[PDB]
Amino acid sequence: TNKITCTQDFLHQYFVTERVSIQFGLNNKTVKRINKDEFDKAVNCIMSWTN
Amino acid sequence: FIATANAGKAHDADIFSVSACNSFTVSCSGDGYLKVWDNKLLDNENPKDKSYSHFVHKSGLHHVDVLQTIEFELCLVATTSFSGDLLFYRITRKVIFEKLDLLDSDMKKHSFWALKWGASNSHRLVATDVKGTTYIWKFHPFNWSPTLELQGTVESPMTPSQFATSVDISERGLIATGFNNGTVQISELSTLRPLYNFESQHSMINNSNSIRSVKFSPQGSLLAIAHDSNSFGCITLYETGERIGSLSVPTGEFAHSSWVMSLSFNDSGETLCSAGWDGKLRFWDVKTKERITTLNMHCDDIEIEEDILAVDEHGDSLAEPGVFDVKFLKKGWRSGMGADLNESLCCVCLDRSIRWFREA
Amino acid sequence: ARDITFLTVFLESTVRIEGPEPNSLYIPLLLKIKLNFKMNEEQELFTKLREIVGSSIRFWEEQLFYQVQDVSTIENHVILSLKCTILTDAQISTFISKPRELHTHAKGYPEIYYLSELSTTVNFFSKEGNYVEISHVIPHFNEYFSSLIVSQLEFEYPMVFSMISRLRLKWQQSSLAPISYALTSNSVLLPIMLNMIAQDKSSTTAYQILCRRRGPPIQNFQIFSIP
Amino acid sequence: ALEGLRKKYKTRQELVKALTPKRRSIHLNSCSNADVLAHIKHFLSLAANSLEQHQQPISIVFQNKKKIHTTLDFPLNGPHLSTHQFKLKRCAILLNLLKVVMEKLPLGKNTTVRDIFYSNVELFQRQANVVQWLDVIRFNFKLSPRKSLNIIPAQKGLVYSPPIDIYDNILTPKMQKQTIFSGKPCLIPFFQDDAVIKLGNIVIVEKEAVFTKLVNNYHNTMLITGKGFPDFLTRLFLKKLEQYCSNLISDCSIFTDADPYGISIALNYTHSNERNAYICTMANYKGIRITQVLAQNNESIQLLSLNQRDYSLAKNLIASLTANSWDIATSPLKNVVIECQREIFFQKKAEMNEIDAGIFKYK
DNA sequence: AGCAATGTAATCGTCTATGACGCGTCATAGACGATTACATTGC
Ligand SMILES: [Mg+2]
């Protein structure tokens, strides 16, 4: 498969600690995971902003 | 002198130390046996009767101190067994040995070697460990609920962390912490800062040069210090730090022909007691620095014939025994003829005999 | 020259293997990280992005036990030269190639497919447009690579991009020879035992996340930092 | 790949089961030479079959000596990382030792541990590794350490008897008897405890350097010795002497310098802890003590000062020697305890290299 | 040089503090102490 799942998304479904991600350092919860159709509509809105 | 009461085969291991506070002649020994020899003994009877023993520790006891005050009749005994701990005891009267552990539980983590109590004239004590730190406590009896609070963190000047052998307290504020190789540090009571720390001047050629004992003189200006030169013992005084000479027998200059093991200053600073492993005692005038007299030590001097210990366990003849310690009992402490006006002496020889002596 | 392209995953706010056609373990060259930049740029932009690219060098060198050779712009491209250190040419020859000839009759053998540069590039869009705002594009850049390494590109290429596999082999590569030399005694188990160290899924960092995690620090995993 | 597979297997439970590969556990544990060789040969073969054909991770499992499950596997099945996990070298050492033992077993001649270590130095490294793994293997098969698996210690203790006939049964199954010569400073090569010794004032010397002065002087004291810490064969030899020819000898004595190490050596000679097979309670302690060097320093020894480690060892040797024993005054360890008590408080050791005089002679 | 001793670090079990869920209770995880292995000392 070639889905390419985000690291962020991986923790939240399964066993979370929110502390172990500190030393592991995978934590950066700003960009967030973007769904494919919602990704398309979002990039369309971003492009439409530029004009 | 006059040979007053003694006791042979008192203990069975090695009897290492002795102390006294008028009523008592407390003496710890090898196999953890505090055997307080009640001092006020009349007639001629040997002090065993008054020997109120109490098993303390299986490891083994080297040192012992005791402080009697005049309040309440508080009187404690402090021993520092070979295993590294502070065994205290409430001695109150047939005396009962009631152990009050007035220390904490997080501090019993290193081996304390020697200690000295400083009377309130505010009771204190200092007990240096085998790492080098010169620990200082503070006593607060109050209703029986003592608490011993730690204040001392006097680190080891001489490097690295060597054997802190000797301990003392000045009348005013000074603490001489003799080390395994010279460097008798002088510190202050309430500043925790090491003052002038000297060394044994005659330190030529790599050899053993230890500090068997340091003892201040009454008023608090003299700093007589014993040490060990190779296989010979000497004495070196100071003022509380300048070298002012060395006691020596008439003939290098040595006080004894062997190791000088323990010292003691009298009530007002006129005499010194040099306890040597050679087998005798030499008394010195502090001001003039000559020897007053010589006191031979013999095994047969024990009054009871069955208590004589002239042959060791292995089989040789230790006729002349070593003296692990000698102590002074102040004016009027003993009981007998001329006890009030005369100062008294006490010694603990290596042949397991504790012998008292009267001034004459 | 097999080519694999991952599905376009872009979150905002193509591995090339130069081996024959085929159960097989992959190893790097002797490998490049080479991403193109555009705003649907080499001018100005690229010049600091290059340095931000160099900011990953720690992760590339301290963590993955790699070694850089050059970072020189190729027109509109950043070269991140990477040569293998754990598996040198001598090591690959000794392990998988030399015993691949003597013991032909033995089955269960792995075919080497060398891995070459992978370039999965996505041009992110920002409201600023002409000018560029920084100090958040740093987590923005870290997120994609951190997700790519942990999740997909490590369950089927363990030997070429994994974190806790390469280190495990380096811990156990020195003693890998006597074990085979004392079991079947010639050399035959040695071109496979390297294809079994890489073929376990318990060594992936995904497993290491969900375990009891007894040893407190490891695998800092923070890459492409600010210059 | 976790991408596109997480939907099949849910939650942290059973996902570790999925990611963990199944381990084909192999029991090294669970006996004559043929019986011992059968298990060893089957073990290596069945371990190799899994790697060669099924590509299944092996897991060497065994129960070591108790002070118990322990596992060494390949390829580090372990979760996360543990700095200790640099241990596949120990597994390789175990496998190589098994191979070497199985190869040298049918030859029928015992080979020393030092020879085995010298044969392959790169992987074994320190001989302590081989020594420990040999004991682990012996205990794991329930093989008695006394009945060696054709592997013997390299031999240490020398003697200076002025005969000492040794008899033994030699395997290959056959029994043969031999006689070994003595009479000059040399070594007695080997004899099992099942084998017994005969004989045709014993002075133990632990330093072995002062030994090679008293051998020169000799001012008829058969002079059995060892080295710093005694080898197994030396204590075996002393026990065999006391067990078969005790009558002829009289007053055997140890002689160690008065450091904590010297008294520890004398103790290890005379008295051992809970596990004891051979202890030689015969021996008497008349070593050169603290009160045998200071009381002679007037008509000379260098002397020394206590080190931090020496004091710690001597204090630890005081906690033990008397923990259960009720009284110091009457006890078989009275002399050692009191001597260490004196040495702790005197603060000075007394090494013996120059005091060598007629102390060794009884009277 | 075969056979010891110990100090230290790493790991494992247990206790308690905090957060979450249906003011009390349960689960989880972080920190502390105990146990053991390895090697750096040493004749
Ligand atoms: Mg020595």
- Does residue A2 belong to any structural domain of this protein? no
* CA→C1' distance for C194 and E3 (Å): 39
- Among the candidates D129, D151, D173, a domain finishes at D151
β-bridge partners, B150 = B137
Please state the domain count of chain A. Answer: 1
Please list, in sequence order, all residues whose beta carbon lies within 8 angstroms of the beta carbon of residue B256, skipping any fewer than 6 positions away. Answer: B232, B233, B249, B274, B276, B277, B278, B280, B282
Pairing outcome for strands D24-27 and D58-63 = parallel
* Touching status, chains A and D (3+ beta-carbon pairs under 8 Å): yes
| The 3-state secondary structure of chain D, one letter per residue | CCCCCCCCCCCCCCHHHHHCCCCEEEECCCCCHHHHHHHHHHHHHHHHHHHHHHCCCEEEEEECCCCCEEEEECCCCCCCCCCCCCCHHHHHHHHHHHHHHHHHCCCCCCEEHHHHHHHCHHHHCCHHHHHHHHHHHHHHCCCCCCCCCCEECCCCCEECCCCCCEECCCCCCCCCCCCCCCCCCEECCCCCCCCEECCCCCECCCCCCCHHHHHHHCCCCCCCCCCCCCCHHHHHHHHHHHHHCCCCCCCCEECCCECHHHHHHHHHHHCCCCCCCCCCCCCEECCCCHHHCHHHCCCCCCCCCCCHHHHHHHHHHHHCCCCCCCCCCCCCCHHHHHHHHHHHHHCCCECCCCCCCCCCCCC
Residue A36 belongs to what domain range? Answer: 7-50
- Among the candidates D133, D151, D169, a domain finishes at D151
Give yes or no: D118 in active site: yes
**Interface contact C152-D86, CB threshold 8 A:** no
Which nucleotide has the shortest C1'-to-CA distance from D351? Answer: E43
What is the CB neighbour count within 10 angstroms for residue B170?
A: 20
Is position D52 annotated in a ligand binding site?
no
- Does residue D340 belong to any structural domain of this protein? yes
- Does residue A19 belong to any structural domain of this protein? yes
- Does residue A1 belong to any structural domain of this protein? no
Interface of D with B (CB under 8 A): 286, 291, 294-295, 297-298, 300, 303-306, 308, 311, 315, 318-319, 322-323, 327-329, 334-335, 337-338, 341-342, 344-345, 347-348
Residue D342 DSSP SS3: helix
Residue B325 DSSP SS3: strand
Which nucleotide has the shortest C1'-to-CA distance from A18? Answer: E29
Residue D33 belongs to what domain range? Answer: 17-151
Q: Indicate yes or no: strand E within 7 A of the C-beta of D217.
A: no
What is the rounded distance in angstroms from the CA atom of residue A39 to the CA atom of residue C227?
30
Residue D309 DSSP SS3: helix
Task: Return the structure tokens found at C214.
Answer: 């007894």
CA D363 centroid distance within chain: 35
- C-alpha distances out from residue B170 to B14, B117, B181, B264, Å: 30, 10, 22, 13
Same domain, D279 and D176: yes
Same domain, D102 and D217: no
Please list, in sequence order, all residues whose beta carbon lies within 8 angstroms of the beta carbon of residue D217, skipping any fewer than 6 positions away. Answer: none
- Does residue D352 belong to any structural domain of this protein? no
Same domain, D247 and D333: yes
* CA→C1' distance for A16 and E23 (Å): 27
Ligand 1 midpoint to CA C117 (Å): 66
In chain A, which residues have their Cβ closer than 8 Å to the Cβ of C207? none
- Does residue A28 belong to any structural domain of this protein? yes
Residue B126 DSSP SS3: strand
Q: Spell out where B197-252 has E strands.
A: 225-229, 232-236, 246-247
Q: Indicate yes or no: strand E within 7 A of the C-beta of D304.
A: no
Instruction: Give domain limits for chain C.
Output: 2-143+150-210
- Does residue D4 belong to any structural domain of this protein? no
A1-51 residues touching D, CB cutoff 8 A: 1-5, 10, 13-15
Same domain, D253 and D312: yes
Of B60, B181, B210, the CB nearest to D318: B60
Same domain, D227 and D254: yes
Same domain, D127 and D191: no
- C-alpha distances out from residue C43 to C35, C48, C124, Å: 15, 10, 17
In chain A, which residues have their Cβ closer than 8 Å to the Cβ of C213? 20
Of D51, D77, D91, the CB nearest to C192: D51
Chains with ≥3 Cβ pairs under 8 A against B? D
Q: Indicate yes or no: strand E within 7 A of the C-beta of D271.
A: no
**Interface contact C12-A32, CB threshold 8 A:** no
User: What CATH number is attached to the domain comprising D221?
Assistant: 3.40.1360.10
Same domain, D65 and D167: no
Ligand 1 midpoint to CA B351 (Å): 28
* Residue in chain A lying closest to C150 (CA): A7
- Does residue D12 belong to any structural domain of this protein? no
- Does residue A23 belong to any structural domain of this protein? yes
**Interface contact D75-C197, CB threshold 8 A:** yes
Q: Specify which residue's alpha carbon is closest to the C1' of nucleotide E36.
A: D67
